[PDB]
């Protein structure tokens, strides 16, 4: 894999705060959907389109981003300032495939009856004794 | 945090293959957008809606899923069979916030000129000497 095939430490290194983003009054069929600042469409490929602060990484900058891939600075955003990098992903499934835990043990707290209603799910979410943990999830 | 507040190993444990999914001929304003098999809308909260094979985890099953949270089996899918769990996330940004690496060193391979075109990005993606690595990314 790329992380090991090349000797990246021979290149200048910079630290960033990394986030993820995807495309999308625009819908996936519209001609302007997915267009980056630079004019190219978002792309995940050998060279993927990423967003940066152009005063730190100019448009056209090529970066190697470990466990993501080569990135080309193609996009910007008003919230993308300083040593900030927004990594493009096509879908939620793709980002979990690349960073989430696939092999997972889970615990069975209560077996279902076969049905659940909005009222029942709300009453679970409102559980008085668990509200201290809810802030994290909601 | 929940992972440590309760003694989960006192509950039955099962292994799954975990993936991520999100909502969405439907668009976010449509009344039927985001509806799960069970009839409830997808939700990320103290109790989040997840998808399973109902012959393994019936609808209404409550699971504790480490580093995700409590899940209620609310959804199904033709591809969700066996010991398979699909974890709901609202957005790509959320799944990277929860599983991606935020504190990241990146390497500067080439500084940009300020512009990049579709043709130029394509020529990068077509780089003959790097095609062996491309299968992974595309």
Residue numbers in the entry:
A (entry chain A), B (entry chain A): 73 to 96, 101 to 214
What does the paper say about this structure?
This paper describes the first structure of a group of peptidoglycan cleaving enzymes from Firmicutes, called stationary phase survival proteins (Sps), that are involved in survival in the stationary phase and are analogous to the resuscitation promoting factors (Rpfs) from Actinobacteria. In this paper we present three high-resolution crystal structures of YuiC, an Sps protein from B. subtilis. The overall fold of each domain of the symmetric dimer consists of a mixed direction six stranded double psi beta barrel surround by five helices. In all the structures, the final two helices and the last strand of the beta barrel of each half are supplied by the other chain in the dimer.
The apo structure forms a similar dimer to that seen in the R3 structure (in this case with the dimeric symmetry axis corresponding to the crystallographic two fold axis parallel to the unit cell b axis). In the apo crystals, the two fold axis is crystallographic. The apo structure is locally less ordered than the substrate bound structures, lacking density for residues 97–100 and for four residues at the C-terminus compared to the + NAG structure, which just misses one residue at the C-terminus. Otherwise, the apo form of the pseudo monomer superposes well onto the + NAG structure with an RMSD of 1.15 Å over 135 CA atoms for the pseudo monomer. The domain swapped dimers superimpose less well with the RMSD for the apo dimer vs + NAG of 2.81 Å over 241 CA atoms as a consequence of flexibility in the positioning of the pseudo monomers within the dimer. The region 176–178 lies away from the sugar binding site, so the change is not a direct result of ligand binding.
